[PDB]
Symmetry: C5
Subunit: 376 residues, 5 copies
């Protein structure tokens, strides 16, 4: 993931022009090879026309170039690219939102699974580790980087997400399908056992734990479904074919013809199609956005940092359920205990924000007449 939010916090005079100077996760990095190939083909055709063809061959080539230039209709390609890229971007954001996070489960566990002793610690840590293991299994199923990190269930066990006995049971389970749900069923069984033992003090807490677990498991399953059901191959091929057809038409009919021939719209020979190159840049980059976002779990610069997320989630959940459990600071009266109102201080760099009128509603400046305000 390439983050530039701090660079675009304010709308500045430089603005996106300064973003144009970034290399990592950039259009230049994604497209320079294709740009070189396009320019090489164009320059090869130009050199052939200038130095290889005879007079008759050059006349026929000029006729063909004029013919091809009339098919450079970029409105249909813009339509298809816009709709396809919008679909891909929305699917990309949905896939990111389908990533399983243990924050809700960890809050629920810290608030519902009790016991400061080793057995309570074991319950909380095991539940959080089951959630993390389900996330890791689905992520190694769907993400190339996570699979590289955990190429085998042996790697999963060594990482600490699964134990040896749990691995034995996991392998003994006879199933030909992805087993990312097995830790979720383990979580359900362990929550039921903890409720039966009294570690979970009420059926309402058990129901809350199971609801949060169902949310987490549903997110994992949504990740699996996004991995399985790809964006229609026919749609992807249609968009690629449209772009390639337009680029072929441009690369043929954008050749600089001889000015001496007196053709319409061909009287200046720049030897380098600056605007055709810019059009290729814009449209190929529009397609490269979809190319990069189509599988957001690869090793692109803008692809999701699933390994970092795994580490963060595991550490945070373990902290919340083990070290932060029942260690609240003693209840003490806060700063504004005797203050009727409450407003925190402003700094010298933000005090200007004050004196801005507090918004109360759009209708509090009407100032009607007296007789219009009288009830009937």
């Amino acid at each position: 993931t390439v983050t530039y939010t701090a660079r675009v916090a304010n709308a500045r005079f430089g603005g996106f022009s300064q973003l144009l100077l970034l290399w990592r996760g950039s259009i230049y990095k994604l497209l320079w090879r294709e740009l070189l190939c396009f320019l090489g083909f164009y320059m090869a055709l130009s050199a052939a026309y200038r130095f290889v063809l005879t007079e008759g061959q050059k006349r026929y080539f000029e006729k063909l170039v004029i013919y091809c230039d009339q098919y450079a209709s970029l409105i249909p390609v813009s339509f298809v690219l816009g709709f396809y890229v919008t679909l891909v971007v929305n699917r990309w954001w949905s896939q990111y939102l389908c990533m399983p996070l243990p924050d809700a489960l960890m809050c629920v566990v810290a608030g519902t699974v009790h016991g400061r002793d080793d057995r309570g610690r074991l319950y909380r840590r095991t539940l959080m580790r089951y959630a993390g293991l389900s996330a890791v299994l689905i992520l190694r199923s769907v993400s190339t980087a996570v699979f590289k990190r955990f190429p085998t269930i042996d790697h999963v066990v060594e990482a600490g997400f699964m134990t040896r006995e749990e691995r034995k049971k996991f392998e003994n389970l006879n199933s030909s399908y992805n087993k990312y749900w097995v830790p979720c069923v383990w979580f359900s069984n362990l929550a039921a056992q903890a409720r039966r033992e009294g570690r979970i003090r009420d059926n309402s807490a058990l129901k809350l734990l199971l609801e949060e677990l169902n949310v987490f498991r549903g997110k994992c399953g949504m990740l699996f479904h996004y991995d399985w059901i790809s964006v229609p191959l026919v749609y992807t091929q249609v968009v690629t074919i449209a772009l390639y057809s337009y680029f072929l038409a441009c690369l043929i009919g954008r050749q600089f013809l001889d000015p001496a021939q007196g053709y319409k719209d061909h009287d200046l020979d720049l030897c380098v199609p600056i605007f055709t190159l810019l059009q290729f840049f814009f449209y190929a980059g529009w397609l490269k956005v979809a190319e990069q976002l189509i599988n957001p779990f690869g090793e692109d610069d803008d692809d999701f940092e699933t390994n970092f997320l795994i580490d963060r989630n595991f550490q945070v959940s373990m902290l919340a359920v083990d070290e932060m459990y029942d260690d609240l600071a003693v209840l003490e009266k806060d700063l504004y205990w005797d203050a009727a109102e409450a407003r925190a201080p402003y700094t010298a760099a933000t005090v200007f924000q004050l004196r801005q009128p507090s918004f109360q509603g759009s209708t509090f400046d009407i100032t009607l007449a007296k007789e219009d305000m009288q009830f009937q």
Copy 2:
């Protein structure tokens, strides 16, 4: 379903060009017959013009071709295709999301329906099988492949989704409408009975089971509604008529007229409309995307694997509720029990991912001045 996520994990130099080489679920497979018919009509008209018509007939044909060439306005057809295809694709993804999955119900059942004996096994397996039977009934109602697999309720019974007594009760129920909800009502009655017998230990567990069952039944009903309420036939016919009108205009006005006649924009005779064929490819494939996705339960390559989903769901739910029940590995301390922090190891192929700074927020590089930091 045609899956190419691993092929597009990273944005590579090849990119979608390698996808252009795929045949299954491909635009070529979907459109080669239509392309052949289009090219045959075009070549028939061209051969007639070249070899059959007299001089006057050829003159009139050239006039007609020039006339029809000015009605080749692809912007409206692009508009209609874009909007219609976007609607169809969104409806396709929604329909896929409406498929009933037993994962949540199976987790809840393993957590809440108790008893390691035969009666507890029967309760859990019967509930899971009722969910699976409702899914199978709706799927055989809405999907051609599932119907071919289960052409009759006799096939349903032989597959083990329904028993003979259950089939007796199902046929005895007097209803002229689809009965996919009968297993859901049986699930409600069985959950109530299990709660009454103490198998379900609390009203909260019963409520959770009923909520999950209602979600599952609502998904089945959503599948039925999507099957019933087709995309407006008027809209489909409008889009088809627009595409066919454009293709007729192209097939008449893209004819290669005699260069000897000195017509404007007709000076080169390629004998093969390469760019008209490419435009046909692009637009016909754009429509074929909707053609394939309009009923995602057919037997297209990209249509949903409903039978595979049935098998997977049934086996996984049976495993979770029968073999996975109350067989947790003995609670054991994990790898990071004594470790204050927690971070799993990286492999040599992904260790490069480390040294990437951990994202803390976009505001943690501002580095303000000292006096601006002071509270008022």
Copy 3:
């Protein structure tokens, strides 16, 4: 509702061309009168130009036709039609989804309202009938067909949805607004009474019943809101005016001028504007899609079959809550009781679907190197 899902299950060579032959709920049925009027106006103008006007009048008419043909800008009309029709179609699907269905309530009632005696039957049937009566009241408020079926509350009572005492109370209620919520309040009161009497065995069951009732009532209220808040009349008039302006410009400037006059782009006289007629077909049908879907509760072919829905819902809910309750086949071991795995048989017509590899994840073909798999 016109259903053609089975016709489009697979993407076939015929495809939507076969749909073009359907009459019910079709563009031809919706638009043939408008097409006849357009063609009549066009032919009247053409006949006047050919046979009525003098030479000077014909010259001025040719000038006017040339002038009008330059305002045939269809891109803005395509934009407005696309956006307006997309809004209308989305609103149409949302309105369909807002249709009240009793499936969830009937499952909850069969599971929570108990008693095989007459009083329990009365409780369940009365609750389901209250839900059905609220649905019928809102539907007769919002749908012309349902109102024609139930022109009066006397019709509602005779249909069996309301009793005489209930009608007395309903009329005694002093309200000047729609009373579709009165059955929902009756449902709340009756559920509370049943819980008090012990028919509903727990507060969790009562809460589940009230939540399902609130969902149902909210759907009824959404139907009322969709009926009340129409798509903006200004927007509808804008779209209609744009379409009519374009069609007037076409009907004037698409006249076939005399070829003898030697006008640019006017040298062939077909006597029948085939392509203008096709353009009118496409755009008028695009508008007719919104015209039909704007009120999906009328009596169009593609409008919702609300009376069928009412009958189906009432019959199914009565069956579920009266005959189905406490009627479960004796718990019996299923086909795969002793089978570790579970997979139903395939038919000879679908066995080909097997041998398709089971999808496990997109990362399970990477096949990395040995030294890259080693943990740091």
Copy 4:
């Protein structure tokens, strides 16, 4: 709100042409002054050109008109208008859906807050009145009509939504922000008190009441957020500037030049720009749609009838929680008590709908071969 749903129930031959004759909440009413100003400027320029300018000034004016006519690019303005108006319309529907309604809360209160005596009546009525008062406070904050109805909290008290003691407490609360949430906090306190006294009979009922209250308060807060966070002023100004630029270009370059001068595309002088006025009508109305819907709480014809909603909600909630409480008609057997099936009668005007086959699924006409149905 202008309602025309009954007029568009069916797709008729007249259709939207009849809506074109409606004045209230219409494009004519919204745009006739702007149309008059546009036509006045155009006619002033035309009269100046015809009767004021000298020959040289007229020649320069014709050159300027020809120059300005080449910037009449309506595609970008169509793009911007379409996207901006779609955003505004979606925001308008969301704002309407954010309007607080007491139907769910009143059903829950009638079901859960008990006591037929004066104290139970007081509890129910006070809870419903707190909800109504919160709605009224937010509505008078955000809506000009509601503010004019209730210019002061004294007006609120006299209307009956607030008492004198409650007004004293509400003014005593020391807050510089909108206090629409104070009635919601009062509702929470009163529900807790009723639960403590046993008027609410269970913790599940109390939790359901609090959930419904949170939904209602969230809708009120959403209304406040929509009022505060306007559509970006930069976006609104951009759209307005684009429209005005296009209209200036049209008003200059659409002048009817002298035919005697023999300019290309200027040989007919109609003395009135019929098509330019039509384009102005269409585009200015497209923008007027957003102008009207941008704040749907003003006093436009199509703006929401918030005062009617207030009256309806208050009366209906009071009826439901006071007069409808525990006054169910005696449980009696319905019409279909002894009928296995259930179908209400049809009228002579709708009996035609019968004989339409009942939809069972899209796969129930396949009629496969016998040997294809055989399980492997």
Copy 5:
């Protein structure tokens, strides 16, 4: 945030023209520097052409201008800008909706955490302060203004959102990731402790508190995710490059060539490209909408007022949970206690709203025939 809702409450003759006069958060303020730079470059090129170039250089410059003017294709740039800006605006509204508000939690706390003594006050105030502290932590992570207000956790402590003991625990927590969730875990622990002590009187209330806390924490996490996952840098760079390419083509090919040269479409020299400047205004402002909204937590005029939101939330939550707890006005009969109906009075300025018929449904004007109403 710039609020102009009250200015656009009604669709008026002035309309958005009056909005065009606003400076704060306006297109002029966002774009005048870029406009000055564009005009300076254009005027520099024009002055060079007029006063520096030789005759041959001017001829070549005219050739280049003519060549560049035919690449001014604004349809693709409009497409890309429209889609990108729509994505950015939708993400902006979603980010605003993801801002944590304490209203629901404060209502739940006032209703469920009991005790009028110091310990109950401490419980309620501490829970509300934990929610506020989590919001403040996430907001200082993601927002430049909030970070400037709270550059350090010392600033957080001085503001009263965190105490010294809580700060010590917060720093002792060993985590390398953002700790905005620590107050949420503290909230869970404190709620569990209060339930165990009896301050929270039921498991249902504890579950409601934890559900509201999970909603709040999920909103905070959504804010973090929006901050981290920026809009694709490739997409942003593509849009910027397209805009800059179009503006370069315009700044070259929109030069006013010498009329004496007799070029097509170059016979009038205005010396100032009014329409090119207007096009730059429109498109640069369309991009500036995205520039301003891309990070809505910066210090733009239209950016969210997060500091005001923090102050308001803290003040309101403290009021609700401390001062408004269990101080309801004594239950008293309301104004309409004996009134069968209920309708508040209208003022003289809104009584006109009456006499509008109450909407009952769209089918209540059909007025069918007698014999059509008869049941079969």
